[PDB]
Amino acid sequence: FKFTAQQHVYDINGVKVGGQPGEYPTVLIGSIFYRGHKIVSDGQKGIFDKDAAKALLDQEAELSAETGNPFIIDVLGESVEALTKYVEFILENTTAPFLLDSISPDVRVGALKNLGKDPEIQKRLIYNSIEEHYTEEELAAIKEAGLKTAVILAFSKKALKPNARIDLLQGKDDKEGLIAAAKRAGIEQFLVDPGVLDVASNSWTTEAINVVKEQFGYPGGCAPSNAVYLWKKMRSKGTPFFEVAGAAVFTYPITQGADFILYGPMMNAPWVYRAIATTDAMIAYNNKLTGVKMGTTEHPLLKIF
Amino acid sequence: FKFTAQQHVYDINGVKVGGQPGEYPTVLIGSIFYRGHKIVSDGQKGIFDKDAAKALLDQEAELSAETGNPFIIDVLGESVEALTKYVEFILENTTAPFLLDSISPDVRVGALKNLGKDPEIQKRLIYNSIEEHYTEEELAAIKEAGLKTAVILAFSKKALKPNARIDLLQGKDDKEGLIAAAKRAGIEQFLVDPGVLDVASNSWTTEAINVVKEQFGYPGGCAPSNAVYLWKKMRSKGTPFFEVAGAAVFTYPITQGADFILYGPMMNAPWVYRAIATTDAMIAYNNKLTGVKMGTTEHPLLKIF
Ligand SMILES: C[C@H]1CNc2nc(N)[nH]c(=O)c2N1
Ligand SMILES: C[C@H]1CNc2nc(N)[nH]c(=O)c2N1
Ligand code: NA
Ligand code: NA
């Protein structure tokens, strides 16, 4: 299958994201310094294990080289001080783009103030995320940092149907759309994430991704890890049961044309990359019947066999 | 996915198979007494550890109870003598339907002849398979046994592309095709398996399944285990990498609306059921979007969380 809209393919410091099914490999987004991450000893001051963090980043680079799946790092923090330090470390110790991420918007806003309108921030930092409850001070922070790419979290607990994402992105009635809000902040590139409520509802998330790509052509993706980790019935079963269940959840959106996955903690990268690459390879092989051309030779189909 | 044709749903000795995506859970088909199966001490005579075989069958029943995925046993043999004994064992030690499977048509036919005319065989034995090399002797043996369900296997190296596999199924030119052959044998229920040439082309396998369900409405599925076990680069990585890659392969057809998977050796059931059930749960959550109703309460969506 193909989408009618011309697909936007962004190039974020060399990472290509978007396209028609099978054109580009899935972009994989692994979390670091998340709540409970054992490499963080003090999440307020940002005391973390530099060697362990570097080893995760090097592992990510190695797996990416092996499969062809590009990576963007999801950098989480619980305080301005911590997130600032984490970002400084990531800037120095990988080349990847990264999500500036926090549960608390004020942590993201304060970290942007510290980082400043640095050209490297413009090129590599992706704001996670412009969401339903965005504030004007947030948009001001984004603009003052000169950011160009954001995740648009097109999710509303009051708007669970896929088609509603037209409404969240474009606006409806007196509500500014999330795309319009992002554009007011100077964002030019929109990674659309419809949100995941729980494992089962990943199918609605994926349907939303399909509506977005079909009608607007923005890259579409999602973050099913939190749902998977809340699935104690599976996680407690150990290896390889947790990993194959996780693989089924994380690959599902890709099978319906999604472009990127936030797969949770980076420690799971070794199995996530192997599963996702498999799915990507099968999808691109289908291109041979559809006439879609691979956009890069650095693709799982050409690498993993 | 919702398919164009009215779907055929079969009830094979209590196993429902077929339908629109999300109607019924995936049917899982595990192999026993395959070449190299270590519980078999003599594959020519069909001598095996009956307790170990029963333990596999009991595990299958337990997993099926856990997830709601029904099971059919893939009973393999390399000799008439062996396959006859295996069938007799399966008849007595489970209530499940089963595939009468051999790579050798002479073995299938000989075994089938040994089993006579038996209503229990007619209800539970699924012929694996009507394939490109069928003979009139074979069709007549099937008719004598009074079988009503067969796997219709479009695996052919002269039919690589999906449409070529559909030509093998429906007939073309001077060939009646496999469905027509099966009907001459008195088969009334068709489990269509387009074959798996290799891992990447599982997407072509799946496209063939899609065309089958689109045009004919027969249940569709496939058997990707051999392709996965021959994937040396990924198998060499060990656990859990091999299993997650396997899970990506085995779940892919289900994500595109397929009805059953022959998942390989029964010893892999514990991880296969967990992956497949996950995919099934997500698909059934889509039911409201597609206009589909669950056909049973015994579905992963209602059991695995
Ligand atoms: C748990 C929340 C946190 N932040 C998120 N960010 C993205 N991008 N996607 C999500 O689903 C979520 N979910
Ligand atoms: C090698 C063949 C043997 N028999 C089969 N039976 C089914 N059902 N599916 C297959 O792929 C195959 N492959
Ligand atoms: Na892709
Ligand atoms: Na095959």
Automatic annotation (TrEMBL), chains A, B:
InterPro entries, alphabetized: Dihydropteroate_synth-like_sf (IPR011005), MeTrfase_MtrH/MtxH (IPR023467)
Keyword Methyltransferase: yes
Keyword entries, A-Z: Methyltransferase, Transferase
Catalytic class of the enzyme: transferase
Keyword Methyltransferase: yes
GO molecular function list: methyltransferase activity
Any one Gene Ontology BP term: one-carbon metabolic process
EC number: 2.1.1.86
Family, as annotated: Belongs to the MtrH family.
Protein name: Tetrahydromethanopterin S-methyltransferase
Organism for this UniProt entry: Desulfitobacterium hafniense (strain DSM 10664 / DCB-2)
